[PDB]
């Protein structure tokens with residue numbers, strides 16, 4: 001697909017039997033999704049924004065789907081003001097910036 | 100051009116006669132640049148991220164050039180961990196996400 005930037009680039013992301021709305025974020029290395037229950041083990045991680053650090057749970061090797069495109073990667077689960085898909089998953093769906 | 104997302108999408112921008120490096124950031128509505136000297140009148144603004152808000156100066160009708168594409172728009176000046184080109188300007192130069 002081609003996604004315009006005339007409004008925020010919002011998509012539904014599927015992880016297993018869970019659906020979440022998320023913002024395609026080329027400004028972020030990592031994917032951060034709030035309030036979801038993935039199974040199995042996680043690693044603790046501090047991630048930074050302008051005013052400090054949020055603690056998140058790092059989930060590796062997760063199967064995700066975005067607009068019919070499957071990808072594998074790390075999801076960070078923790079409180080975020082918006083759910084964001086960073087470049088770790090943007091590259092895995094073959095997403096580029098074009099102008 | 101086409102910009103893959105394997106690396107941070109940092110581009111050179113021309114603004115107020117000077118060349119600066121900036122992050123192309125589809126996760127942000129607005130363009131935020133490190134303190135620079137811009138001529139003329141400005142409007143006070145507060146912009147939020149993780150943990151709080153940063154005081155910025157809002158300047159309208161700023162000529163900014165990115166990879167040949169000359170745009171005119173609103174730039175917010177103040178402290179930021181990285182210069183960010185937001186959707187206001189990205190959509191102005193016909194930037195899209197494609198996969």
Ligand SMILES: COc1cc([C@@H]2Nc3ccccc3NC3=C2C(=O)C[C@@H](c2ccccc2)C3)cc(Cl)c1O
Nearest residue numbers: 027028029032047048049050054080148149180181
């Ligand atoms: C490219 O360099 C940077 C990029 C970024 C990324 N882009 C931003 C660019 C300019 C200002 C602020 C953000 N903010 C966030 C970003 C992230 O990658 C993580 C994100 C986040 C999400 C949820 C919970 C906590 C944190 C906060 C941040 C910093 Cl501090 C950088 O130095």
Ligand SMILES: COc1cc([C@@H]2Nc3ccccc3NC3=C2C(=O)C[C@@H](c2ccccc2)C3)cc(Cl)c1O
Nearest residue numbers: 050081082126127128131146147148149153178179
């Ligand atoms: C779509 O909703 C939001 C988008 C964003 C934007 N993208 C992020 C997405 C997830 C987590 C954090 C950031 N952070 C920043 C963002 C901005 O648009 C401004 C940016 C900034 C830059 C310099 C100085 C101050 C602030 C901080 C933030 C919040 Cl709080 C949102 O609710």
Ligand SMILES: [Cl-]
Nearest residue numbers: 049050148149
């Ligand atoms: Cl932030």
